[PDB]
Amino acid sequence: GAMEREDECFSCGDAGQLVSCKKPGCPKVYHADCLNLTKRPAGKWECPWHQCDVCGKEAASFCEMCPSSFCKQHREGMLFISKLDGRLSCTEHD
Ligand SMILES: [Zn+2]
Ligand SMILES: [Zn+2]
Ligand SMILES: [Zn+2]
Ligand SMILES: [Zn+2]
């Protein structure tokens, strides 16, 4: 993190061997295993929660229930506000 670092994996909902994002505005942490980080990131690492789950490009919207964020193109119709808590939820959370 660059301000704080929560002690739970946003991907799994579990805590453990966590690697934190080194980008400002990101308090989130994840497991290297669930991220498929076979290669150990060196230096500034940006979590895939900044990457569009569809095209792999930079995400503009962030699903608040999974590391599947979306770009300006792949966010339309794919991400919506959950009426349960007001959190951004993607269509893949049935
Ligand atoms: Zn995990
Ligand atoms: Zn991040
Ligand atoms: Zn995209
Ligand atoms: Zn989602």
Q: Is 17 exposed, middle or buried (0-12, 13-18, 19+ CB in 10 A)?
A: exposed
68, amino acid identity = S
Domains by residue range for the chain, with CATH: 1-94 (3.30.40.10)
Distance CA 90, CA 78 (A): 6
51 CA to middle of ligand 4, Å?
13
Q: How far is CA 89 from CA 2, 31, 76, 78, in A?
A: 25, 22, 12, 9
Ligand 3 centroid from CA 90, angstroms: 13
The experimental method, as deposited, was: NMR
CA of 28 to the centre of ligand 1 (A): 11
Terminal-to-terminal C-alpha distance of the chain: 30
